[PDB]
Amino acid sequence: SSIEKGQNRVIDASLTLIRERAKLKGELVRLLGGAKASTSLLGVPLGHNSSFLQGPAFAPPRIREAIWCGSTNSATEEGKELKDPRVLTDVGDVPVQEIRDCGVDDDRLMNVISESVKLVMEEEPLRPLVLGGDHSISYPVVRAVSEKLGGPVDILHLDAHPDIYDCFEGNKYSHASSFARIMEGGYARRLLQVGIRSINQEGREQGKRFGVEQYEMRTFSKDRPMLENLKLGEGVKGVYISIDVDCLDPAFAPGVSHIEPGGLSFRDVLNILHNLQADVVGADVVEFNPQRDTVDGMTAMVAAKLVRELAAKISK
Template identity: 50%
Template sequence: MDPVFHLIGLPTDCNSSFERGPALAPPLIRDALWSDRGNTSCENGMEIGCDFQILDKGDLALAEGPDDDDLIRKAVAVTLQEHAIPILLGGDHAVTYPVVQAIHAHYGQVTILHVDAHPDLYHDFEGNPRSHASPFARIMENGLAARLVQVGIRTLNRHCREQAERFGVDIIDMQNFAPGNVPGLSGPVYVSLDLDGLDPAFAPGVSHPEPGGLSVRDVLNVLDRVTGEIVAADIVELNPRFDVNGVTAIVAAKFVREVASRATASRKGMP
């Protein structure tokens, strides 16, 4: 049976700092995914609808209140109970914490591949422990991940450096980046792709652009370093308010296809 992926939109940005806007992103990523400007093929030769299925579950009815995390956990749990693979469309990066909570409840500790300009390890940011700058601190202090590998980091301040040491985070920063420097990642693997991990030339539509980042090809090469089973993924921090001709949404849609195809390959025993 071909793998089935559930596409779930998380339209929230209440935990964003500096700028709002990522809550608007999920419909635009969907539009780019299904647009006639492209097709349903992936770089490993697989095709949506032939080798795997993507079922669009729409956006969760998030109210940007205290019940949102539970709604996210329940939606992911339902997907897993149906033996499908969740791909979450943010929204800001704060959504990763409740998603990983649900993944951990099903699989136990996971290996996390995190692509980002920022380590998102603040104990709290501006007094908010659920800030989009803090999800991986919450994940690591609660023992949800056996390993956290961060790629593309180029804003590591003293506090986050101390947090990385505290939690034993593997950081491949941009000064030392090469795809071969990323360790092979065994499963179960959770992939978290913050679009500002890309250089702004490739993804202008983000709230916190940071020059000197990854290319789209770099990210695809990093995904090829995953040797274990990809059990879930999120693609976050697209801010349509700053996008240019929809290019960042198109990149996000590309990542949906390529994460799904690589997850399918791992299940079928393909390289």
């Protein structure tokens, strides 16, 4: 009624905001010349699919402040210039809270996040890097990348958790279920999960069902050489990388909802990302919880540096 049409006008004005801002970043990259791919940040400030704490809703603006901190320089480790738009642009945040606040259901909210990602991909040669937000957001992002490209992607999923519960606590959009949604829908072929150390019988059974390659930290000593020399995406249209910050031991990343000892070092993660051979078509950095971070924002710098090194990898 009056309501459904009111909701459509807020949704439409939200998509228009992303569309106009993408257009300006696309024109800016196309004007400078030569880029084959150019990382564009899209923020999805959503936390209500979280099982424990909703703090990731507040992450994307903290991440951006950390990327540009006066304490850092603008060069990535392998020497890309983050001030160059062909390396990194930013189309801003999906207005999630404003959409929820007007009574929009999750089916439609997640549809708006997909469309938001399509708006970036439709500006050549931008490729999306999504700032979460809780891990529920990887389903509408991966769906949007798969649909746009016209086939399943191979995924590298860095996570303490496999996020492959059929329906965690009745919520099909649970942050603990988004890789079940992705695999059910035929949006991914290979799913490599690395850093896994919190998994139950359902996680293992769902892993076998979907053909997932689950690397547990209890075999990391033996798996490290293979994980520091990954080659992904041959025979599919691209590779997507999803990083839950909780792939890192809490010593490196305390600013997470799920503290799970025995994880990767920051340098372990960069060894995997730097050495990965892959046509990276998209990526996300999720589950940064600023409310659980240190008083000085150490996990914000962790999330920012992951974003920066993913941008170097995506942009070419």
